């Protein structure tokens, strides 16, 4: 067990990392379905590499590799949607955003590094259940943390791993750099709490609306950084139909799995969205969600960067298909 892990590092820290072109990770329309585990890790390395993070922060191939692997093994396999392939698909979206969407040219190297590390670990040790549930079931994690419970935990984990020996991919940073990187990373991961996205997006939607929004502003920026996290965290909804189709199948199951617990240990009725029996009201529930949470946001993101439009396009394109379905 420890053995398969350790050879995994041997084989990984010695394979050639293919180009970004080869890996089609520059694409908003990208899919992981056909990649192996080892391949995904490789992409990740290519990500760090092509963002100049590797060179500008004196990362040793050895270390990065260990770290990456560590994150991989700290996502739960038994968990339907919120496994490693989610953290990975998010980071790739994030990567695609900075490159093809052209945002890199809009922010610092400290920020880029933080976003990537955050994107990768924003859901660590997610146990396939929402903040709402853990709160209502008096999980000890709820006793520990106040608000954004899970997201606080995801970070507690991220940080535990970065402090692990031979995982200090940050070891190269000045203490001041390190110190503020971590700050941003904390902000990023917490931002993936849907509740904060909601309690904050209004502000941001207006600066856009009023043609006032401007990156230069320190605060305006860090808000946007939150919004960007959300944007990638659920980028799945902006995928080609056949993909969106299938990934919506996982979210489906994971929800329904929680729904079961709600009436088996909690003895409450689950929301329809997690009510396994109501599987036939999926598509409208999808529609309402896309309307409520998504289009709104990806629109904004394009006003900020035009080259980010494919996200908006793919989003409404799926909304189209769910709506049809909802009408059988």
């Amino acid at each position: 067990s420890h053995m398969e892990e350790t050879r995994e590092l041997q084989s990984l820290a010695a394979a050639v990392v293919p180009s970004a072109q080869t890996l089609k990770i520059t694409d908003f329309s990208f899919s992981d379905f056909e990649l192996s585990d080892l391949e995904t890790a490789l992409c990740t390395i290519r990500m760090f590499t092509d963002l100049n993070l590797v060179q500008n922060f004196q990362m040793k191939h050895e270390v990065l590799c260990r770290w990456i692997l560590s994150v991989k093994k700290n996502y739960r396999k038994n968990v339907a949607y919120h496994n490693w392939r989610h953290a990975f698909n998010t980071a790739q979206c994030m990567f695609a955003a900075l490159k093809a969407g052209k945002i890199q040219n809009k922010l610092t190297d400290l920020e880029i590094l933080a976003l990537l590390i955050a994107a990768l670990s924003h859901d660590l040790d997610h146990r396939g259940v929402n903040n709402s549930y853990i709160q209502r079931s008096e999980h000890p994690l709820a006793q520990l943390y106040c608000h954004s419970i899970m997201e606080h935990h995801h970070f507690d984990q991220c940080l535990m791993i970065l402090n692990s020996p031979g995982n200090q991919i940050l070891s190269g940073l000045s203490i001041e750099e390190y110190k503020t990187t971590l700050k941003i990373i904390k902000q990023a991961i917490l931002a993936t709490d849907l509740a904060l996205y909601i309690k904050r997006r209004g502000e941001f939607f207006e600066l856009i609306r009023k043609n006032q929004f401007n990156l230069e502003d320190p605060h305006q920026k860090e808000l946007f950084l939150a919004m960007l996290m959300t944007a990638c965290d659920l980028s799945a909804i902006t995928k080609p139909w056949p993909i969106q189709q299938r990934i919506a199948e996982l979210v489906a199951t994971e929800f329904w799995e929680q729904g079961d617990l709600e009436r088996t240990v909690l003895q409450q009725q689950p929301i329809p969205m997690m009510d396994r029996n109501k599987r036939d009201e999926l598509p409208k529930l999808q529609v309402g969600f896309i309307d409520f949470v998504c289009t709104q946001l990806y629109e904004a993101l394009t006003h900020v960067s035009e080259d980010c439009f494919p996200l908006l396009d793919g989003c409404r394109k799926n909304r189209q298909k769910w709506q049809a379905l909802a009408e059988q």
């Binding site: 709402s132 309690k199 929301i271 969205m273 309402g288």
Partner: peptide, 17 residues
């Protein structure tokens, strides 16, 4: 997690709050 009471239904019927 305190929001406007009109919002509350939509918020909950999706996995939020």
């Amino acid at each position: 997690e305190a929001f406007n009471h009109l919002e509350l239904h939509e918020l909950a019927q999706y996995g939020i709050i």
